[PDB]
Amino acid sequence: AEIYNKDGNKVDLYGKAVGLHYFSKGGENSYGGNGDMTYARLGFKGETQINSDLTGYGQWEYNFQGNNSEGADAQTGNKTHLAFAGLKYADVGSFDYGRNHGVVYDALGYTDMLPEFGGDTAYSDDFFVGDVGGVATYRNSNFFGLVDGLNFAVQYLGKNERDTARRSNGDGVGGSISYEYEGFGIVGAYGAADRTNLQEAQPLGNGKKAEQWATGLKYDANNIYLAANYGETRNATPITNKFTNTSGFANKTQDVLLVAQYQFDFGLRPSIAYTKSKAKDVEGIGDVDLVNYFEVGATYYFNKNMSTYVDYIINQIDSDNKLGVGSDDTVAVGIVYQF
Amino acid sequence: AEIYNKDGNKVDLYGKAVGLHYFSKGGENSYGGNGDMTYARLGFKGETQINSDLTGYGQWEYNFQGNNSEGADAQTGNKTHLAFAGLKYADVGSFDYGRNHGVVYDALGYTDMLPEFGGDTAYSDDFFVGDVGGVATYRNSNFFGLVDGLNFAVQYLGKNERDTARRSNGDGVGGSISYEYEGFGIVGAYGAADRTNLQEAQPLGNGKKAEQWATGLKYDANNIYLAANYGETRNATPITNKFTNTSGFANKTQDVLLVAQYQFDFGLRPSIAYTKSKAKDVEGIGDVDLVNYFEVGATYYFNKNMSTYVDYIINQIDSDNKLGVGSDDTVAVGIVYQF
Amino acid sequence: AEIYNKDGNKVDLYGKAVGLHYFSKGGENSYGGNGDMTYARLGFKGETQINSDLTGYGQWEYNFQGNNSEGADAQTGNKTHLAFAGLKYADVGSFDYGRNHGVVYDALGYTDMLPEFGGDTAYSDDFFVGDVGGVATYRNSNFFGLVDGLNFAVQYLGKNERDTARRSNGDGVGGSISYEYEGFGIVGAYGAADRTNLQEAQPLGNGKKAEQWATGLKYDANNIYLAANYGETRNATPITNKFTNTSGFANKTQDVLLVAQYQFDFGLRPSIAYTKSKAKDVEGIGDVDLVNYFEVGATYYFNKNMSTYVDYIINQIDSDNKLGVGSDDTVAVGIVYQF
Ligand SMILES: [Mn+2]
Ligand SMILES: [Mn+2]
Ligand SMILES: [Mn+2]
């Protein structure tokens, strides 16, 4: 919804209301939980033509949970998703700064396409893999305008010394390179950052640097969407041990995500996917699967404003998992109005 | 404020800023309290024409309190009022899901018309009587298009197992039927739900099912608004005992609400009302009035964007009330800008 | 961004996304701190022409911090900046009520012009000097339309009995008078209010009334902005003692703020400023500087939507300060998209 378009400046207001319910047995031992998961999003996205070569931009988006009471829990799960501003010049590149996606998400975004679930390794506030505060990101499209389809990025992660180790990080650098051709896309991305003293002080995890990288392929054409990600992390993936009630990072993980989807012209978009994340070298445990499931699902698009969906997670995690990770299935049912 | 209207999709942004002050003696023993009560609302309401018979819709509304400091109390009273999405077909009905009004509010809305106060039994997060998370609601207008003025609804309340008993509920079903003719409206509505284990574990209240029903009449025509509600609840109305510092639900209540109002063409709308809510079978007490007052008030509408109002509550609750319910009067003064 | 303009009613939606980073040594002993300071603003401002002499209005603005994780700290620093509604008549005056600027801010606003910092004595939730809840404000423009450039205001501060003494206040009255001529402006403003029992009970500070006043001059013309404020407070300025971990108000302060700025036509706006705030009669200390710095800074305006800035605070506070006030420098770097 364009609310302003005079000369230089264009502003869009956008939002959505998501009626959403999760069904699981009982559901504290399930993949996704059980009960109402309704939420809403509001945001703006703006762009100003400063001169013939230079554009300025900003974006903001907030999440308002709709599954809280109006009492003490009213704000649970509310947060800023995105908040950044930047500048883009000609065929030189773009620079933005704020709360934005980590550069490894350039790869992980390939498989973050499921109706409701998926994208399990793109954790928020986790270095370079998901949403993260205080990133400066340089992006180049079409390699200075010389090589069509060839993009790269360089990202500096500023340190965020927060109260919890889960949500903190030290200074870091990361980058990504991407090539797209005839409906395919190839991507690789890598970042390394320091860990904070509060992260080192955690039982689970040990080392001075956190590292994350991932590669991916996608195909996105002729009504088909197929993608695969591979990734490895060092001291970056957050974990909990529900037996020892302790927490930290995984010394190492290996991550695989696959998705295949077809879009029928009358609106139905079935989805199948697989996701497997395994950790290693975990103080008091050894090797343990963090995520392991098959997904079968569908979205029905009535048009670009209205959709409904069912997302079924066949959870392959075992009831004996050493970290306590839930092993039951979850199915989501969603109805979405957006503008 | 329509911010988009192209072909299928219409989106309205709406909001208001309410400068509001409550005057009571001292005011911890008063009906409404004392001090600044300023707040603001923002929302969106959208509608998409999917085909000739089928429309999609969404609505979201948030409350931002304006009577908090910017310190630790900044978010007190902030919350999502509404957040839902749905579909409406032809002369078959509508279905929506999310945070929405309980179906008994179809009746109680009849008397929830006072400038500031009123609607005292339409508690939020209380089964079917007010705002509630995780409801699916089927609505039929004009009985499949066969009987003009005859509407009904069926609502399934999904369970919300929250940290407090006050804000929780179990699975439930409810319905309402309504008939309107020559400026009158007749309504009845009933819902029953299970209570959670955390609700059963509360001192005040006992039983496995919560029930709420209400009937109402209104007249709304020739510049007059007159309405009456009657209702009864079992194990549903929340209560506190300020002597024993305990809390729970009332085993039973009986509720009466009356309102009469006249709208002068130059803008003044005087209001008088009566509200009485009495509980029964309360562990350690017996019978006790929850609400008991006369209201005299007026709104002045300058136009549809700007209004001012005074709302006087003559509180008939006694200083000896057994639950500690406040007995002093309260008067509100409000100035409202909305769009 | 005007989202509605039909006949009587005009509504603007406004907002901004501020990518912002503070650099200080380490930075718990610095002026501004260290790390990401990204935030966003959203608001609306509306105005209705009720008749030829009478206009109605409302404004709301919220601050959403973008430097929080999505965990427990998600809402830190979020708040309502402004929330009020009012009426303006002909050449009689305006009246509004809500969360608005204290009338002493009529003076202090003169020097609150720095790219990022500055305006250090316009504390929020501090009687009349900054943002404050529950104020009713009468304003007269051009002295009933008789004396061009001559404005005054009268403000009644309603009592806000909050959980902390820092954020509370008692009933109070304040006023301001202002004269503008040939690019100059002269202002004086005074307010006095009662303190609450919780404020009296604080170690630092003693007395039954809080008082704040300030005068100022500005020049704002020919691309130059020059301003000076002087102010004195009694029992109003909040203070902390980081040695004794105690808090309260200063028995007295004296405040000086100066700013000079030049706006080049191609967009660069350099700024220099000085700010000094000194307290007196502080239980267990005597005299101590609260603020003391030089500022050198610049904004580059690409256009009215996009800007960038650097703001350098040369902090003159000493490492031995008796209240523990930080003594290190801070520099901010900001990139701003607004509409
Ligand atoms: Mn994201
Ligand atoms: Mn409601
Ligand atoms: Mn302000």
Curated annotation (Swiss-Prot), chains A, B, C:
Q: Name one GO biological process term.
A: protein transport
Pfam families the record matches: Porin_1
Q: Which InterPro entries match?
A: Gram-neg_bact_OMP, Gram_neg_porin_domain, Porin_dom_sf, Porin_gammaproteobac, Porin_Gram-ve, Porin_Gram-ve_CS
Spans within the Extracellular topological domain = 24-37, 66-81, 100-133, 159-170, 195-209, 235-251, 281-290, 315-329
Membrane topology is: Multi-pass membrane protein
Q: Does the keyword Transport apply?
A: yes
Q: Which GO terms describe its molecular function?
A: colicin transmembrane transporter activity; disordered domain specific binding; identical protein binding; lipid binding; lipopolysaccharide binding; monoatomic ion channel activity; porin activity
Keywords linked to the UniProt accession: Cell outer membrane, Ion transport, Membrane, Porin, Protein transport, Signal, Transmembrane, Transmembrane beta strand, Transport
Classify the source by domain of life.
Bacteria
Which factors induce or repress this protein, as stated in its UniProt record? By growth in low osmolarity conditions (low sugar or salt); activated at low osmolarity by OmpR, repressed at high osmolarity by OmpR (at protein level). Levels of OmpF protein decrease in a lon/ycgE double disruption (at protein level).
| Knockout consequences | Leads to decreased susceptibility to a number of hydrophilic antibiotics including ampicillin, cefoxitin and tetracycline. Deletion of ompF confers resistance to colicin E5.
Localization annotation: Cell outer membrane
Instruction: Report TM segments.
Output: 1-6, 8-23, 38-50, 53-65, 82-90, 93-99, 134-140, 149-158, 171-181, 183-194, 210-221, 223-234, 252-264, 267-280, 291-302, 305-314, 330-339
PANTHER family linked to this entry: OUTER MEMBRANE PORIN F-RELATED (PTHR34501:SF2), PROTEIN YDDL-RELATED (PTHR34501)
The text of the family note is: Belongs to the Gram-negative porin family.
Descriptive protein name? Outer membrane porin F
This protein's gene is called ompF
